[PDB]
Enzyme design. Structure first.
Site, PDB file in Angstrom:
ATOM      1  N   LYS A  12      -5.473  -4.392   1.263  1.00  0.00           N
ATOM      2  CA  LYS A  12      -6.161  -3.802   2.402  1.00  0.00           C
ATOM      3  C   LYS A  12      -7.073  -4.858   2.997  1.00  0.00           C
ATOM      4  O   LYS A  12      -7.690  -5.633   2.263  1.00  0.00           O
ATOM      5  CB  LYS A  12      -6.965  -2.563   1.996  1.00  0.00           C
ATOM      6  CG  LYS A  12      -6.128  -1.434   1.409  1.00  0.00           C
ATOM      7  CD  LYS A  12      -6.982  -0.237   1.016  1.00  0.00           C
ATOM      8  CE  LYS A  12      -7.104   0.761   2.158  1.00  0.00           C
ATOM      9  NZ  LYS A  12      -7.760   2.033   1.720  1.00  0.00           N
ATOM     10  N   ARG A  15       0.482   8.334   7.200  1.00  0.00           N
ATOM     11  CA  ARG A  15      -0.922   8.476   6.826  1.00  0.00           C
ATOM     12  C   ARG A  15      -1.718   7.224   7.177  1.00  0.00           C
ATOM     13  O   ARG A  15      -2.843   7.042   6.719  1.00  0.00           O
ATOM     14  CB  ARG A  15      -1.046   8.799   5.339  1.00  0.00           C
ATOM     15  CG  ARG A  15      -0.607  10.216   5.011  1.00  0.00           C
ATOM     16  CD  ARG A  15      -1.662  11.228   5.453  1.00  0.00           C
ATOM     17  NE  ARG A  15      -2.886  11.054   4.679  1.00  0.00           N
ATOM     18  CZ  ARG A  15      -3.183  11.764   3.596  1.00  0.00           C
ATOM     19  NH1 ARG A  15      -2.354  12.712   3.175  1.00  0.00           N
ATOM     20  NH2 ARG A  15      -4.311  11.537   2.939  1.00  0.00           N
ATOM     21  N   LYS A  16      -1.114   6.366   7.993  1.00  0.00           N
ATOM     22  CA  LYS A  16      -1.762   5.151   8.475  1.00  0.00           C
ATOM     23  C   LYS A  16      -1.563   4.987   9.986  1.00  0.00           C
ATOM     24  O   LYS A  16      -1.248   3.899  10.462  1.00  0.00           O
ATOM     25  CB  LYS A  16      -1.213   3.932   7.725  1.00  0.00           C
ATOM     26  CG  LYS A  16      -1.710   3.815   6.283  1.00  0.00           C
ATOM     27  CD  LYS A  16      -3.152   3.309   6.259  1.00  0.00           C
ATOM     28  CE  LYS A  16      -3.821   3.530   4.915  1.00  0.00           C
ATOM     29  NZ  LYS A  16      -4.036   4.977   4.624  1.00  0.00           N
ATOM     30  N   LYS A  29      11.102   8.875  12.141  1.00  0.00           N
ATOM     31  CA  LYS A  29      11.480   9.653  13.315  1.00  0.00           C
ATOM     32  C   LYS A  29      12.363   8.877  14.291  1.00  0.00           C
ATOM     33  O   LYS A  29      12.040   7.753  14.679  1.00  0.00           O
ATOM     34  CB  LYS A  29      10.225  10.135  14.043  1.00  0.00           C
ATOM     35  CG  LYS A  29       9.315  11.017  13.209  1.00  0.00           C
ATOM     36  CD  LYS A  29       8.049  11.360  13.982  1.00  0.00           C
ATOM     37  CE  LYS A  29       7.115  12.250  13.181  1.00  0.00           C
ATOM     38  NZ  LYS A  29       5.831  12.468  13.910  1.00  0.00           N
ATOM     39  N   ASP A  84      -2.869   9.204  -7.134  1.00  0.00           N
ATOM     40  CA  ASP A  84      -2.954   9.395  -5.691  1.00  0.00           C
ATOM     41  C   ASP A  84      -1.673   8.943  -4.992  1.00  0.00           C
ATOM     42  O   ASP A  84      -1.371   7.749  -4.920  1.00  0.00           O
ATOM     43  CB  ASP A  84      -4.160   8.643  -5.122  1.00  0.00           C
ATOM     44  N   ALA A  85      -0.929   9.916  -4.476  1.00  0.00           N
ATOM     45  CA  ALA A  85       0.353   9.660  -3.833  1.00  0.00           C
ATOM     46  C   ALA A  85       0.214   9.057  -2.438  1.00  0.00           C
ATOM     47  O   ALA A  85      -0.735   9.352  -1.712  1.00  0.00           O
ATOM     48  CB  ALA A  85       1.163  10.941  -3.765  1.00  0.00           C
ATOM     49  N   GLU A  88      14.841  16.442   7.483  1.00  0.00           N
ATOM     50  CA  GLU A  88      16.068  16.946   8.083  1.00  0.00           C
ATOM     51  C   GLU A  88      16.809  15.820   8.783  1.00  0.00           C
ATOM     52  O   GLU A  88      16.203  14.989   9.457  1.00  0.00           O
ATOM     53  CB  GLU A  88      15.759  18.074   9.070  1.00  0.00           C
ATOM     54  N   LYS A 115      12.101  12.199  19.007  1.00  0.00           N
ATOM     55  CA  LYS A 115      10.759  12.653  18.678  1.00  0.00           C
ATOM     56  C   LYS A 115       9.776  11.970  19.621  1.00  0.00           C
ATOM     57  O   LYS A 115       9.546  10.763  19.520  1.00  0.00           O
ATOM     58  CB  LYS A 115      10.414  12.347  17.217  1.00  0.00           C
ATOM     59  CG  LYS A 115      10.939  13.360  16.198  1.00  0.00           C
ATOM     60  CD  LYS A 115      12.457  13.329  16.072  1.00  0.00           C
ATOM     61  CE  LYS A 115      12.932  14.265  14.975  1.00  0.00           C
ATOM     62  NZ  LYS A 115      14.416  14.310  14.888  1.00  0.00           N
ATOM     63  N   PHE A 125      -8.179  -5.996  -9.608  1.00  0.00           N
ATOM     64  CA  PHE A 125      -7.191  -5.182  -8.904  1.00  0.00           C
ATOM     65  C   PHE A 125      -5.791  -5.554  -9.404  1.00  0.00           C
ATOM     66  O   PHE A 125      -5.009  -6.175  -8.685  1.00  0.00           O
ATOM     67  CB  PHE A 125      -7.319  -5.395  -7.390  1.00  0.00           C
ATOM     68  CG  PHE A 125      -6.525  -4.423  -6.548  1.00  0.00           C
ATOM     69  CD1 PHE A 125      -5.756  -3.422  -7.124  1.00  0.00           C
ATOM     70  CD2 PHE A 125      -6.561  -4.514  -5.165  1.00  0.00           C
ATOM     71  CE1 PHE A 125      -5.032  -2.544  -6.337  1.00  0.00           C
ATOM     72  CE2 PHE A 125      -5.843  -3.635  -4.374  1.00  0.00           C
ATOM     73  CZ  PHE A 125      -5.078  -2.651  -4.961  1.00  0.00           C
ATOM     74  N   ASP A 136       0.870   4.270   1.147  1.00  0.00           N
ATOM     75  CA  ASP A 136       1.186   4.912   2.415  1.00  0.00           C
ATOM     76  C   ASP A 136       2.201   4.102   3.209  1.00  0.00           C
ATOM     77  O   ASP A 136       3.134   4.655   3.794  1.00  0.00           O
ATOM     78  CB  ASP A 136      -0.081   5.115   3.251  1.00  0.00           C
ATOM     79  CG  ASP A 136      -0.969   6.217   2.712  1.00  0.00           C
ATOM     80  OD1 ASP A 136      -0.447   7.130   2.042  1.00  0.00           O
ATOM     81  OD2 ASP A 136      -2.191   6.179   2.975  1.00  0.00           O
ATOM     82  N   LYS A 137       2.023   2.786   3.227  1.00  0.00           N
ATOM     83  CA  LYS A 137       2.907   1.922   3.998  1.00  0.00           C
ATOM     84  C   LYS A 137       4.269   1.758   3.324  1.00  0.00           C
ATOM     85  O   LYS A 137       5.272   1.527   3.998  1.00  0.00           O
ATOM     86  CB  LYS A 137       2.265   0.555   4.230  1.00  0.00           C
ATOM     87  CG  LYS A 137       2.211   0.186   5.702  1.00  0.00           C
ATOM     88  CD  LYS A 137       1.336   1.176   6.466  1.00  0.00           C
ATOM     89  CE  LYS A 137       1.493   1.029   7.972  1.00  0.00           C
ATOM     90  NZ  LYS A 137       2.714   1.706   8.491  1.00  0.00           N
ATOM     91  N   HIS A 190       0.846  -1.188   0.000  1.00  0.00           N
ATOM     92  CA  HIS A 190       0.000   0.000   0.000  1.00  0.00           C
ATOM     93  C   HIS A 190       0.886   1.244   0.000  1.00  0.00           C
ATOM     94  O   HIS A 190       1.868   1.302   0.738  1.00  0.00           O
ATOM     95  CB  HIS A 190      -0.957  -0.001   1.201  1.00  0.00           C
ATOM     96  CG  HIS A 190      -1.945   1.125   1.180  1.00  0.00           C
ATOM     97  ND1 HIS A 190      -1.621   2.405   1.572  1.00  0.00           N
ATOM     98  CD2 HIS A 190      -3.241   1.168   0.786  1.00  0.00           C
ATOM     99  CE1 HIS A 190      -2.676   3.188   1.430  1.00  0.00           C
ATOM    100  NE2 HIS A 190      -3.672   2.462   0.954  1.00  0.00           N
ATOM    101  N   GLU A 206      10.533  12.224   5.702  1.00  0.00           N
ATOM    102  CA  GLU A 206       9.219  12.043   5.101  1.00  0.00           C
ATOM    103  C   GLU A 206       9.377  11.497   3.689  1.00  0.00           C
ATOM    104  O   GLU A 206      10.228  11.962   2.926  1.00  0.00           O
ATOM    105  CB  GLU A 206       8.440  13.361   5.073  1.00  0.00           C
ATOM    106  CG  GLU A 206       8.508  14.182   6.354  1.00  0.00           C
ATOM    107  CD  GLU A 206       7.786  13.530   7.522  1.00  0.00           C
ATOM    108  OE1 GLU A 206       7.121  12.490   7.322  1.00  0.00           O
ATOM    109  OE2 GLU A 206       7.872  14.070   8.646  1.00  0.00           O
ATOM    110  N   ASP A 216       6.704  12.001  19.735  1.00  0.00           N
ATOM    111  CA  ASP A 216       5.615  11.375  18.989  1.00  0.00           C
ATOM    112  C   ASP A 216       5.797   9.861  18.921  1.00  0.00           C
ATOM    113  O   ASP A 216       4.826   9.107  18.955  1.00  0.00           O
ATOM    114  CB  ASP A 216       5.520  11.948  17.571  1.00  0.00           C
ATOM    115  CG  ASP A 216       4.748  13.251  17.518  1.00  0.00           C
ATOM    116  OD1 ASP A 216       4.045  13.569  18.498  1.00  0.00           O
ATOM    117  OD2 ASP A 216       4.835  13.953  16.487  1.00  0.00           O
TER     118      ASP A 216
END
Ligand SMILES: CN(C)CCc1nnc2cc(-c3ccccc3)c3cc(Cl)ccc3n12
Ligand SMILES: CN(C)CCc1nnc2cc(-c3ccccc3)c3cc(Cl)ccc3n12
Lengths: 369, 368
Positions: A157, A238-239, A259, A232-233, A59, A263, A226, A20-21, A18, A46, A265
């Protein structure tokens, strides 16, 4: 009075392929590459993935010499994209690098809020919905790579809806209500063959039989064909619900991948999970939520908050005292306790960051109180 | 105080790199919808040192100047000089958008979405996130009218509220801690900023009854904050800020840059609509609504309701009421909430929920 005491809940997961992954994995592949040479590397990577293009942006402060072309292409190769017929090829993709790279009581690097969550409904202290969704994708990847189902392609998915009852604050899974599986495939295999395989060789090999019955609803390849998947990037981070608890507990909004440990997060969310799992495995509660918050200038957490959903004889104030005597949630201490300078992060970037006991934050700390 | 607990939510200003991307993405979405109501848009934005990147897919009859849209968005946000770290006049814009040219239509994807509402504020939102958002909005207001001309677009706020709960209903007692970090010019001194943040921002936003002498203030805690804006910013990296500040639940889908055919957005809006209707309707004090879809299928896979014990009616009964009053098929949601309007750039900062100018914030009168 049966259907008055029950409720449905749904979680989803996505495969390694996927978009995003793909980005999460690449971002953490970069993090690991740096940490392997420089344990003290600062990384904020990123990744953006689209039609024939990978872009790295962010960075980095590191002494490491990292070949980003090699790191990205090996990540994409491992995922399984090695030909244009699959929609993406590690051999020919354009890799654009836009990383600006420089050479215990430390204040938090930012502000923010993070949650940890644990539930006694599975042995891995995780919600059944997100556990099953993840394992469905892992099985797909397994059957693709060993050639059992050679028509499979990396993108997928899954979605699992479980019927629950609540038991004095604890939640008890009764049965699987609905399963969705959509997965990329080649142009040869037909829908019927795929749907039979998805049920018999994937679902039935993953979901314990007691949770499946004749009423269970199956949506296998519901959109049909499929063939072209992947970028669509896609974007890193985003997951984040797939990465954590599949909608259970709570989320503070921070993404993990790309990260390093500084971080909060990432590190504080890992630590919070560590606390939550230690509490449940410690027998102090059946189900628990932990919130931590930081300020960019302060070392100690601004607040630590605990919700046990009523599943403990001890009060939440009491649990907090136990946590404070057993855990030091300052960023600089978390790193030492959970050994977060190791290049271990690419493995977290698919199939969830929580619920797998090979990770340090998944080993319960023995509590003293 | 065995019954009290702290809870924290955060918000960020328009100038925060992630929110810059959200706004640009929705500015692009609006630009298409203004010419073509049926435009299909999936626009991702990346923002880093002197560069904006657009990536995604668009199916539209619109002729959109992406250069103008991006630069005008950055201008509106307030980045118009290099001394601020970013200038709409000189920023590099890379466009990698591939552009191509009823009620029972299947969902465009799969996924799970939540709606949430709580009677603790008039806007049916958690106090923590309402205050956090409004602190950033006040900053932008005072920046734009020239009251605090030393202000710059980038900002972050964080609000910790002391709560009590009564069988699921949440009762805010007081504000425990406030954090405010905001970008500023090189002239103004720290003391002047901190006193201004307290007297002209915090005291102008937070009700006096929630403030006392024990309230903890972290104003410009990192100190000097001259360079802000574009660590890259990305579309969809502030989804908890966008929604309920950690309350309720989140299914993981980002809002900005997605048109109405994306259930990640439309169904989340619809679920909020349902939840707010239930609370404003007096059926409960607090409620969580989950909806889930499968690609190709019209009807929701599941609709689930949690009222936290704040209703005398059972959740099964509340579900019966929802089904009789709402049609949560993607194609019907679009019609009920008028989602083809170019209204989305307005959602991309200060939260998608809690502002009554949006269709999903107008409670439906329930029949049961
Ligand atoms: C008597 N009645 C049947 C009980 C129902 C019940 N008991 N505990 C929970 C927890 C959640 C939940 C909350 C937040 C996050 C995840 C799950 C939940 C969510 C939904 Cl949509 C519906 C019902 C839910 N629930
Ligand atoms: C008697 N005892 C003091 C009660 C405490 C209490 N009662 N209801 C809630 C809800 C949440 C909550 C859950 C999920 C999301 C947002 C908030 C919560 C979270 C935290 Cl960290 C701590 C306590 C919380 N809580």
């Amino acid at each position: 009075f049966i259907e008055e005491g029950t409720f449905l809940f749904t979680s989803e997961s996505v495969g390694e392929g996927h978009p995003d992954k793909i980005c999460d994995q690449i971002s953490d592949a970069v993090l690991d590459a740096h940490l392997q040479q420089d344990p003290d590397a600062k990384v904020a990577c990123e990744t953006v993935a689209k039609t024939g293009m990978i872009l790295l942006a962010g960075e980095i402060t590191s002494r490491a010499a990292v070949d980003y072309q090699k790191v990205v292409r090996e990540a994409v190769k491992h995922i399984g994209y090695d030909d244009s017929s699959k929609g993406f090829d590690y051999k020919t993709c354009n890799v654009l690098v836009a990383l600006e790279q420089q050479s215990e009581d430390i204040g938090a690097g930012d502000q923010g809020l993070m949650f940890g969550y644990a539930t006694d409904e599975t042995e891995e202290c995780m919600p059944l919905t997100i556990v099953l969704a993840h394992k469905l994708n892992a099985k797909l990847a397994e059957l693709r790579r060993n050639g059992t189902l050679p028509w499979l392609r990396p993108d997928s998915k899954t979605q699992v809806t479980v019927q629950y009852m609540q038991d004095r604050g604890a939640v008890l899974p009764i049965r699987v209500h609905t399963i969705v599986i959509s997965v990329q495939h080649d142009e040869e295999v037909c829908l019927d063959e795929m749907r039979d395989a998805l049920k018999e060789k994937v679902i039935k090999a993953v979901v314990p039989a007691k949770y499946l019955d004749e009423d269970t609803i199956y949506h296998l390849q519901p959109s049909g064909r499929f063939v072209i998947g992947g970028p669509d990037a896609g974007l890193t981070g985003r997951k984040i619900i797939v990465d954590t608890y599949g909608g259970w507990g709570a989320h503070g909004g921070g993404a993990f991948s790309g990260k390093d440990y500084t971080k909060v997060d990432r590190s504080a969310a890992y630590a919070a999970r560590w606390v939550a799992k230690s509490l449940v495995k410690g027998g102090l509660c059946r189900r628990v939520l932990v919130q931590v918050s930081y300020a960019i200038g302060v070392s100690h957490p601004l607040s630590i908050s605990i919700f046990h959903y009523g599943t403990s004889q001890k009060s939440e104030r009491e649990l907090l005292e136990i946590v404070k005597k057993n855990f030091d949630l300052r960023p600089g201490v978390i790193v030492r306790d959970l050994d977060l300078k190791k290049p271990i992060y690419q493995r977290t970037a698919a199939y969830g960051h929580f619920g797998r006991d090979s990770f340090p934050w998944e080993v319960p700390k023995k509590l003293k109180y």
